[PDB]
Design a protein around this ligand. Structure first.
Ligand SMILES: C[C@H]1CC(=O)Nc2cc(C(=O)NCCC3CC3)ccc2N1C(=O)N1CCC(N)CC1
Ligand SMILES: C[S@@+](CC[C@H](N)C(=O)[O-])C[C@H]1O[C@@H](n2cnc3c(N)ncnc32)[C@H](O)[C@@H]1O
Ligand SMILES: [Zn+2]
Ligand SMILES: [Zn+2]
Ligand SMILES: [Zn+2]
Length: 427
């Protein structure tokens, strides 16, 4: 069709995207493959470099032995976009670069060797915001070190400026990567990769947005989650919803170089509920969650579960499940149990997250959709059919909006709804 979205110059947040026609919840607004992407640090060698799906066995690239793939088809299909980095990842073993450096190498190779990318239809890498005039001296130093890391990692393939795009400035490129990288999660909402999607990068931030993004492998779908009028700006939430206004302030400053004066931030909306319970306990839980989240990122489920049980079933003082640090611990324990086949225990943690997720993901949000699906799935396979049906329907009501027919997970949910329904039809 014609596009439902268009680029425009906002009054005080740079370029943005606005509706061309009225949009309804669930409407597919745009979709994109990445300009460039890579598997993230914790998922390297756990999921396929190309399709970002996990497998019992992954097969390595023989030349570098860093890239790993689910199948001959994926290894072969990845080769054009892996060929030049392969030499650099070999040449610099056992040093592995930061994800941003691997990502930027892929950018450069794509812009030098590939045809114009469909991912740049509305806006290109060259156009992206860098916020160079807002960077602090401390950030500038961090970028200088990323520049030198790139230069080191890439030296086999990029020796000088003749191998970069015209007038390409690596410092500026890394400044763009910082505030335009997308975090790719798998169907289970586990972080698996990072990518650039330059058309999609037009979206500005809201702490109460009107659109959502979801990933199906590296593919990104942008959908409305509220009614949107002609000319109204499209927004997504850049951040985890389980954050206070103070935490959002620090990240939006540090990473994005802006201040938010939205109603939520002006009123510290939900902050008090999020921090209920004794501060001494939740401070310790927040500290333990650095490690728990590190372990989870590397798919270390037994270690995750052990740390989480030490909190959830502590001998010492406990927190309410609506406290965000307690909730994140429940979440990690649920995902660990699911991955370990401890299904009764998974369901216990999962069920406890349901009411806090209802409060903290208002309206239609993909993370709540997927969490409710997980809990309904656990109930279904434990033979709890009426309870399962209610959750699976709720999951469908959310995911029909946030995921839609174009996302394969919706097909999975339809099969569970059918199975649940047959079971009730017999009963
Ligand atoms: C909702 C989901 C969807 C998803 O798959 N990824 C995902 C991406 C982004 C993202 O890229 N933000 C920056 C946007 C660029 C334009 C400036 C945010 C949230 C995400 N999501 C999520 O829940 N996150 C993030 C990842 C953490 N681990 C926790 C919570
Ligand atoms: C991914 S880009 C979004 C598009 C960008 N405005 C542009 O002109 O390319 C991220 C940057 O947009 C700006 N931004 C996004 N959301 C904003 C908001 N709510 N208020 C002010 N600036 C915002 C900041 O410069 C931020 O680092
Ligand atoms: Zn694959
Ligand atoms: Zn290789
Ligand atoms: Zn805000």
């Amino acid at each position: 069709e014609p596009l439902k979205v268009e680029k425009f110059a906002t009054a005080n947040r740079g370029n943005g995207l606005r509706a061309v026609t009225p949009l309804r919840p669930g409407e597919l607004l745009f979709r994109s493959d990445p300009l460039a992407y890579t598997v993230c640090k914790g998922s390297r060698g756990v999921v396929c470099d190309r399709c970002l799906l996990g497998k019992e066995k992954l097969m390595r690239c023989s030349q570098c032995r860093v890239a790993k793939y689910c199948s001959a088809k994926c290894q072969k299909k990845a080769w054009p976009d892996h060929k030049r980095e392969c030499k650099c990842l070999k040449s610099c073993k056992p040093r592995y670069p930061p994800d941003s450096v691997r990502l930027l190498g892929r950018v450069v190779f794509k812009l030098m060797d590939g045809a114009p990318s469909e991912s740049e239809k509305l806006y290109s890498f060259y156009d992206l915001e860098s916020n160079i005039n807002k960077l602090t001296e401390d950030r500038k130093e961090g970028l200088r070190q990323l520049v030198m890391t790139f230069q080191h990692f890439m030296r086999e393939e990029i020796q000088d400026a003749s191998q970069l795009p015209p007038a390409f400035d690596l410092f500026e490129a890394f400044a763009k990567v910082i505030c335009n990288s997308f975090t790719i999660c798998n169907a289970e909402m586990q972080e698996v990769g990072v990518g650039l999607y330059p058309s999609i990068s037009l979206l500005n931030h809201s702490c109460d947005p009107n659109c959502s993004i979801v990933f199906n492998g590296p593919h990104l779908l942008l959908r409305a989650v509220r009614d949107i009028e002609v000319g109204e700006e499209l927004t997504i939430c850049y951040l985890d919803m389980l954050m206070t206004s103070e935490e959002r302030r620090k990240q939006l400053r540090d990473q994005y170089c802006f201040e938010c004066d939205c109603f939520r931030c002006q009123t510290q909306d939900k902050d008090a509920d999020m921090l209920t319970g004794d501060e001494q306990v939740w401070k310790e839980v927040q500290e333990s969650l650095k490690k728990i989240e590190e372990l989870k990122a590397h798919w270390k489920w037994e270690q995750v579960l052990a740390m989480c049980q030490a909190i959830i079933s502590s001998n010492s003082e406990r927190l309410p499940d609506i406290n965000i640090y307690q909730l994140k611990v429940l979440d990690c324990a649920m995902d660990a149990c699911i991955n370990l086949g401890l299904l009764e225990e998974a369901l216990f943690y999962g069920t406890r997250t349901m009411e806090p997720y209802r409060i903290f993901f208002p309206g239609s949000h993909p993370v709540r959709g997927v969490q409710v699906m997980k809990v309904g799935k656990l109930q279904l396979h434990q033979g709890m059919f009426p309870q399962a049906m209610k959750n699976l329907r709720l999951a469908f009501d959310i995911m029909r909006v946030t995921h839609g027919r174009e996302h394969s997970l919706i097909e999975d949910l339809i099969l569970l709804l059918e199975e649940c329904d047959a079971n009730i039809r017999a009963s």
